Design a protein around this ligand. Structure first.
Ligand SMILES: CC[C@H]1OC(=O)/C=C/[C@H](C)[C@@H](O[C@@H]2O[C@H](C)C[C@H](N(C)C)[C@H]2O)[C@@H](C)C[C@@H](C)C(=O)/C=C/C=C/[C@@H]1CO[C@@H]1O[C@H](C)[C@@H](O)[C@@H](O)[C@H]1OC
Ligand SMILES: CC[C@H]1OC(=O)/C=C/[C@H](C)[C@@H](O[C@@H]2O[C@H](C)C[C@H](N(C)C)[C@H]2O)[C@@H](C)C[C@@H](C)C(=O)/C=C/C=C/[C@@H]1CO[C@@H]1O[C@H](C)[C@@H](O)[C@@H](O)[C@H]1OC
Ligand SMILES: Nc1ncnc2c1ncn2[C@@H]1O[C@H](CSCC[C@H](N)C(=O)O)[C@@H](O)[C@H]1O
Ligand SMILES: Nc1ncnc2c1ncn2[C@@H]1O[C@H](CSCC[C@H](N)C(=O)O)[C@@H](O)[C@H]1O
Ligand SMILES: [Mg+2]
Ligand SMILES: [Mg+2]
Lengths: 252, 252
């Protein structure tokens, strides 16, 4: 980092992930100690008590790569994240556009703003077995729209190039009012959330655009990804980011 | 549209003062409630549990004004802060130099790295009356050199343009190896710490340089300032920053 832009985006990553203050993690799942562990935050493997994103430094770097590549290569369209929690990844995305004075692209912030949904009879058996809803409280997942908006405002990044899509993805995605995406960041964990968004948002991903699957390490998510790719004849290389996330670049 | 440098420095101020995550204050002195209060942090009036500086946004803005003016006007010399706590003001100063790619000035970080000193028989009576040592634990003041170095490194700002001066100001200042200062930021609270640094560091402040007195609202500090200015015939206007700090600009 040397230029003002490089310094800003570097600091923004360290700030939204709270490498700066090194907040404790929630203790849930396979995590058994609250201590901040550098390696865990680096790879987005903990559940921050305070930080605005849980995706970690490697997945923030990937998001920067994808947005910057889209700008560099003239890939048209907006940035959408499905599953935003406290908003840190979307805050970073808006910051990237701000750094490069991009005025013609929007960051779409899609979430229930309620955490994971209760399991229903419609759910895939793998989703029903996992029952992600049981973890909502343990990792402070339910985060209101007002809270997320407040978080954007603390960075000076709440403006008309940030638009919110509140509700369940099955309700918000089919008629979401974007025409094209350059980056589609999927971070909803379940077979259902992944299939919802691949079905309803992926067709608007421009060729040359990036599809990021945050939760590929989760069997149910991975199942949706393969079902969807097999259905559509998608063979674009799945590239690992860290121990959780992957992405591909959409070929024409 | 804000430049990369503007975006970086704005974010750095919000981060070192922790406007981003809004940490509670310690309950000490006249502060009886732990809540983060926006107005208190804006004017540096609380005792942050986590933030790297307690000086607040108004005094951070002052520091930026002083450093940028020195750079712009070609006032020679380094930046020294006497009394750094967790290092956030000095981290900000180093960030300013980084933002403008200044490679030939150093940020000097001077502190006991142990909190306020124990009172002795040699202390000024106003300092003995205050006995600031009694507040060390209450506001988590003692902060080791290793911790402060770690804090710099979290921002990517620990490099050879940051130099540390560990020990009591009366011992470290007379032979501190800087030749010239552009900004002398005094933040030691007491008659003693203020007089130590005015006596031993102020003569190295360049004409056109800035002398910042963080704790001018404290009677003992103010007494040292006036005693020193009267002795040396200094009549440069004392300009108020907020409810605590003032500064003057040294005329030749
Ligand atoms: C705490 C939330 C998290 O909870 C778990 O980490 C649960 C783990 C279970 C305890 C595990 O079970 C245990 O395994 C042991 C090896 C053997 C045990 N023995 C006694 C039977 C068995 O009890 C796992 C394997 C259960 C299976 C079904 C699984 O993979 C579930 C994933 C749940 C993830 C959820 C959701 O976290 C998401 O993760 C993705 C990857 C992150 O980016 C992020 O979005 C994050 O959101 C907050
Ligand atoms: C908690 C630390 C702080 O502690 C106080 O704020 C103490 C205040 C006392 C309680 C006060 O007493 C009360 O006054 C009332 C009018 C009447 C009360 N009635 C019960 C008799 C009496 O109990 C004061 C006036 C006592 C006198 C001796 C004084 O001026 C002490 C100052 C100490 C400041 C210290 C040092 O703060 C420094 O500040 C500067 C401005 C900041 O940038 C920062 O660096 C900060 O350091 C971290
Ligand atoms: N079916 C669904 N519809 C809408 N939101 C959902 C959903 N299933 C899960 N979510 C949301 O998906 C998010 C998963 S956590 C997202 C982490 C975030 N990307 C970060 O940067 O840290 C939660 O905020 C949860 O409320
Ligand atoms: N005589 C002395 N010599 C050296 N350090 C001293 C001192 N008296 C007080 N200190 C130090 O002065 C500091 C006061 S607090 C400094 C606040 C800091 N400028 C910030 O940005 O938040 C403490 O870190 C304390 O250890
Ligand atoms: Mg995830
Ligand atoms: Mg002070």
């Amino acid at each position: 980092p040397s230029t003002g832009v490089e310094l800003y985006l570097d600091l923004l990553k360290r700030t939204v992930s709270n490498f700066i203050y090194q907040d404790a993690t929630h203790v849930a799942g396979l995590i058994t100690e609250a201590a901040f562990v550098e390696e865990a935050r680096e790879s987005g493997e903990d559940y921050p008590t305070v930080a605005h994103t849980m995706i970690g430094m490697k997945r923030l770097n990937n998001l920067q790569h994808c947005v910057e590549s889209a700008l560099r290569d003239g890939v048209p369209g907006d940035v959408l994240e499905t599953g935003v929690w406290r908003g840190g990844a979307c805050i970073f995305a808006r910051g990237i556009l701000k750094a490069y004075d991009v005025r013609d692209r929007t960051v779409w912030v899609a979430d229930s703003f309620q955490g994971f949904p209760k399991i229903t009879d419609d759910d895939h058996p793998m989703d029903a077995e996992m029952n992600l809803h049981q973890y909502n409280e343990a990792v402070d997942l339910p985060t209101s729209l007002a809270t997320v908006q407040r978080n954007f405002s603390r960075y000076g990044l709440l403006d008309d190039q940030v638009r919110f899509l509140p509700g369940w993805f099955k309700d918000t995605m089919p008629t979401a009012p974007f025409e094209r995406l350059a980056v589609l960041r999927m971070d909803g964990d379940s077979y259902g959330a992944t299939m919802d968004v691949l079905t309803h948002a992926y067709p608007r991903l421009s060729p040359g655009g990036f599809a990021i699957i945050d939760d590929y390490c989760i069997p149910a998510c991975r199942e949706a990804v393969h079902e969807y790719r097999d259905r559509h004849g998608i063979s674009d290389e799945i590239v690992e980011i860290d121990r959780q996330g992957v992405y591909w670049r959409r070929s024409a």
